[PDB]
């Protein structure tokens, strides 16, 4: 299960600018891609991850 606190894992699925990388590029299953997107949005809200690279 994807954890929004697992910043090290989550950083593999974001670009340098902070955007969420497409599953067609990362080879991720769709069901797990949705969980990744939710976790990344939660982490952004908690400021564990940036919304944009201009931070």
């Amino acid at each position: 299960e994807i954890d929004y606190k697992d910043i090290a894992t989550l950083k593999n699925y974001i670009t340098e600018s902070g955007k969420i990388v497409p599953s067609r590029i990362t080879g991720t299953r769709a069901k797990y891609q949705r969980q990744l997107a939710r976790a990344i949005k939660r982490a952004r809200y908690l400021s564990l991850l940036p919304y944009t690279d201009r931070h």
Binding site: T15, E16, S17, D53, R54
Partner: protein, 69 residues
């Protein structure tokens, strides 16, 4: 796209790196698509047309790989 020119790195190389990073970020296409409002029916029509074109081109390539000219 934040490109920090490292030491002894030529300006031309730094500029090419910046251009590549901008192209990978796709900011230009985003701005161009945000210049004017696209009605939701228009957006749906365009997405469907792109998907249909991709599928038809792939099928045509598959068929053409098995024939001689």
């Amino acid at each position: 796209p934040v490109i920090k020119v490292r030491e002894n790195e030529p300006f031309d190389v730094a500029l090419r790196r910046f251009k590549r990073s901008c192209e990978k970020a796709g900011v230009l296409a985003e701005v161009r698509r945000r210049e004017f409002y696209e009605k939701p029916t228009t957006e749906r029509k365009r997405a469907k047309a792109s998907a249909v074109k991709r599928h038809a081109k792939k099928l045509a390539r598959e068929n053409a790989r098995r024939t001689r000219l």
